[PDB]
Amino acid sequence: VRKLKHHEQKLLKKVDFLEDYHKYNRICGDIRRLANKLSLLPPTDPFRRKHEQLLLDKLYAMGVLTTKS
Amino acid sequence: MKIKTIKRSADDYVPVKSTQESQMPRNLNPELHPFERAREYTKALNATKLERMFAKPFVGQLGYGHRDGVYAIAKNYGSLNKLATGSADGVIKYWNMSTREEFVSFKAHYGLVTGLCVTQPRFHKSQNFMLSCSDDKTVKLWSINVDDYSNKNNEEGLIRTFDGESAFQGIDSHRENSTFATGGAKIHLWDVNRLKPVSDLSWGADNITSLKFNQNETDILASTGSDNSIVLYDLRTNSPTQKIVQTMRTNAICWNPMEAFNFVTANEDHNAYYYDMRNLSRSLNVFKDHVSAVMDVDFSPTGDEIVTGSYDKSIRIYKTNHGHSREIYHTKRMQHVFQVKYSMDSKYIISGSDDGNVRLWRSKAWERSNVKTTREKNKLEYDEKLKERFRHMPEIKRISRHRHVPQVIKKAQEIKNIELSSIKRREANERRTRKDMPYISERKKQIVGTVHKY
Amino acid sequence: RAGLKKIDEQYKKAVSSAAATDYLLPESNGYLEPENELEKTFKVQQSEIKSSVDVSTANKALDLSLKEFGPYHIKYAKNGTHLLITGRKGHVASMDWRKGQLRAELFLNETCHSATYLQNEQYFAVAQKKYTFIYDHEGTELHRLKQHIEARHLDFLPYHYLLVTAGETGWLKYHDVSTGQLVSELRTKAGPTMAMAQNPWNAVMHLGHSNGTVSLWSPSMPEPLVKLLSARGPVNSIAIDRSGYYMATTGADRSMKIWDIRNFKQLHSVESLPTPGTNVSISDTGLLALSRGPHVTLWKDALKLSGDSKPCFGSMGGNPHRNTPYMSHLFAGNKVENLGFVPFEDLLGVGHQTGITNLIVPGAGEANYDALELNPFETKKQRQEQEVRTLLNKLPADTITLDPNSIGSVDSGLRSFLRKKTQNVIDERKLRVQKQLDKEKNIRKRNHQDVIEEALSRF
Amino acid sequence: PIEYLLFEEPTGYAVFKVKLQQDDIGSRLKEVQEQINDFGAFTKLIELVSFAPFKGAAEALENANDISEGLVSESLKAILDLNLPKAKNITLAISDKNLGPSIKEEFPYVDCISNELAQDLIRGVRLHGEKLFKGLQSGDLERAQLGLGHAYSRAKVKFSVQ
């Protein structure tokens, strides 16, 4: 719509409904929920440690990580 | 066979000229305009929100104010932009409200200026006159050069002085004639061309704390005494007429310009009482939104609105038919409101507080003084009813009723609701057992006694 | 009495002003009556009406044949400048028939159920399979609604700025365009919604199901206003007249049902339909349109209480009580996808798989249009002025009601431990005192309202 | 309390009627001062009622001499008489305080105002100029002011083509 006047703006706000990195943002977010939850799982567990290593190796094997992390 | 179809003439709806206004066809078929009741309500609600946006009552202050607290405000009933003020420093000022500047300033009195009134003395355009009284036992008449008309071209300063045996505490001027009345230890009637009091009026030995001539029966006069009494006077008989004793003193009296027999009283008991001059055994209306003593009260020249200036640092606007303030005006800059007067166009409010400043306030906070277009007009009065109609709509009440009030005022308000609730509960407990306890009307609790019974 | 009387005359004055403005209205609706009693309004064939109407109207009638994504559902904007037609296989194009310019072109290859303009020509929403997609005037998609899944019906409320979608999932989505938020989510419990329609008077949704019950729905309330079954079979379509007095449906069992919303009573029932209606439509003038297979039959003055007004196919020996079809048109070798009247013009649009056709029917449109509500001649700058104002005047969802006239009526440590003990005792006393007051009140009401035992009664 | 306003133009004298009186208390407010600038608002305040063009160059100078000395010319006496009612006393706005006594002498029934309120209206008239004349033939003021310039200023010094 046209630019709303001052009194129009004050009465009504957030009425402006109706390069994109959305996928990479989702890729980054998905990596977060892993390491957050992989922390939730107990440290002595063998299943968590291998799974953490597979992730670190693989984002390394990508080059998202320039060095081992 | 016969066929006709909906047919649009392009020239009719799309003008041939670029500058010609296109025709706006209109059909008032009710079905074509659905959701009346939701619609007007939404226009109502938007108006209340907008009203709080433009509610901008303060406009400015007059010059640099007075040195000491301002304790006498006198308005020129024949001019818009003329005002007379005085403070306890003994200085009196005459103001040009348009330019917010002083016409002239006088060190009139050695003591505190206890009364002021603007007059047109008929000594037996180019100048105006004002009368001042104080506790130094003198009343002085002054003349002011003004620029209202340019038909001439001086003699600016003291014109005449009235010496008195006792201190003068209040002054008012008769409208039709040059005579004026002063209230001190004894209320005295004076004539301009006569140095000593023409007539002596007094109910008794008690002194008089204020007086206000009626604006319509200008021959009637009313006064207030230190003994919590209101005395009525008549000039045709040259004698007092009526006295009523109330529970607590009244500080100011003003007569309703649209209702001559009707006057309001500024009282010390957080209240302003609306009285009919004919039957004073009761009141017409009582105004109870103040939290300290009410110092001054004034009527609108429209007659539908009253302000009351209180010791609680607030000015409250009341409707004559409603007993609670629709509006509250306050500022931390306003230290003790002692005088509240109107612009006699009924559009602005003049207030005087002991901090030494005389402030100007809009009567209607959201109204603006500029000339509006008919379209601007027709929309603005569309809101005022639509707010009036849906005034008790709860959300409309919430947004409309809300005001920013000082913390001292509400902390005073919340407590008095507690003492009053304690009284009602405790009295109500006595209704369970006491056989004979009369119900006391609110309109008669403040009256202690009246001399002339009817 | 004088106050009640005084209030009365302003209405008789106000309606008098309304009667005064009725003269101001520039033009009237159309007519079609035969000069000779032998001539019949159903006998007249559409090409003859095309001849009678002037050149511009012949241009106003549009016929375009295209088969790529058939069938095509036609939807018509409120202001009516712009046509939106959505193909079944997925092709949707937005265009203005009067101007002759296409607003945007979408060639997406996803099966499409329905489409509709939301607030203006500029923004419109098109229902794809398993999701709802919104497209700009430029053709760019702005957002896609994850909440709205598998909706075969799209319906938008102008005064409330809310898009309602009905789908086979049965979950009724309430989405507000201005706030960009889903107002409420509700499950019908009547299964998939076969038919969807809105009543303009009260802005109440109407849903159709296999059982035949019609559920009246609003965003505000948890469960529907009203449940009515008029047709034994599934209700394929629901039509509500412009006034809102009359509500019309066609059952899948060939039943046609005329109903009243305000009184919730059945006007007329017709079981003589040869085949179940594809869709049923109602004019602003009150004239109803029904399409069955390749034949479309229209009845004038159908929405009236009188039995003689009852629609009847053809006539029974030319009986005056029988109501003949006002206009009868059949598209040979064709099927009608949907019917959309053309508000503000005297035409009826009909949707087919071969293409979209517009038929000219006298009296179809409203005679005169209010400029403030909607204007076909709205310029680019005022449509923005109209848009912002209608936003400013947005109606809340909770404001929805069964009757617009009903709304607005008048109805630490140890010390804190000691603190609780006292408050409990303080609270306990109030209960005791309140009991004594209640008991004393009862005594007031009671007071207000063997020979030997009497001798011994004193003891 | 203003009703009529006397404005002098180098082409002639135009008197105006004040339809609406601007608020006197709120004269210094922001919004009212803007109304003076806005032509649409101003036309609601006042309206053109008369205009009397000067016959020629000679009249403009001798009136220009008379206006300056606070004097009333025969043209000023003529235009005012037909307009201001005999009438309590009709109120006329004049930019000059010195011209006030001269008007009062000729016309006892008119009272003159030159307060800031009168100045506010007079300023607006000068601001819009011939736009308020609503098409009345005033030629164009700018060259008339310029033409009256060497008519007025250069008279006082007593040069000669000598």
Next chain:
Amino acid sequence: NKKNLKYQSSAVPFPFENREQYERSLRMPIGQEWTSRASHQELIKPRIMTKPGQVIDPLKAP
């Protein structure tokens, strides 16, 4: 179908002295989309008026 307390008036507004009076006036549309331009002008009009910049004297003897 219970009515929403949010939209029910708490008490009868002034100047109307009875509940039925208000349900009547409430069935007026004041808006111009339902009311003729002129008919708007009698409804639109406020009771208290004033003219800017003039003198409101006390009433003279009737």
Next chain:
Amino acid sequence: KTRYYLEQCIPEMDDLVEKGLFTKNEVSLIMKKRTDFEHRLNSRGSSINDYIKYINYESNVNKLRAKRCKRILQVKKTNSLSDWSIQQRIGFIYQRGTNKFPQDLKFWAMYLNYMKARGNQTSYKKIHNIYNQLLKLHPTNVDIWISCAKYEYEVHANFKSCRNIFQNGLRFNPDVPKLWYEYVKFELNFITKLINRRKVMGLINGDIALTIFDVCMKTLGKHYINKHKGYYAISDSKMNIELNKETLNYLFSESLRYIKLFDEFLDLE
């Protein structure tokens, strides 16, 4: 505010339909043409021809109503709002056009003529009000000073006020020789009718002009000196002689023109 004007006419068409003069279809056509004019007059770029066109169109509507009144009702005047409303509204449009365009002397002229023709319907006081504004707006136009002087010396025959109009006009325009001639011509007309009345009085039983002559030379000379001299006096002695000569030549032609006036009046000496 176009709708306001449209609404003021509603009672009238209702009266037209009620009396049966105009059908609802014909009434609608009159409304549609009326609507186009009102938007035209209220819009930007509106000109006087719009007022004239609307007045001319509205005048025709009055004529058809009058013809149909005798044709259908068979009545000279039907006692209802229709009779005086078209006539009232035309004056309203004249007021707006004259108010909107005070400059055009032509538009004012029809207004006076239109109201003058309907003398019974428009009081002579209303003609007075129009002239007072017109003289006030255009004081330097001699034709209007002689206009109202001619109207009332013939229709009303008020010599006192007819003297007054000229008496005002000469105050504003003392340099125009035409206005002096008409005020002399009126003066001898008053004397001759007075003397002819005196002759008639006997049957059933002037210097003042020469004074108007006297001053008429003096001021015309003064103004002619003011013109042709510009802002300043003329230093050269010789030119001042030609300036005097030019006035004498200008002045004599003014006098000779009046000698021709005397010949017309036979009764006067």
Next chain:
RNA sequence: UCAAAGAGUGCU
């Protein structure tokens, strides 16, 4: 060119 978005000017 249309087509959507800004920022000034004239004037009711």
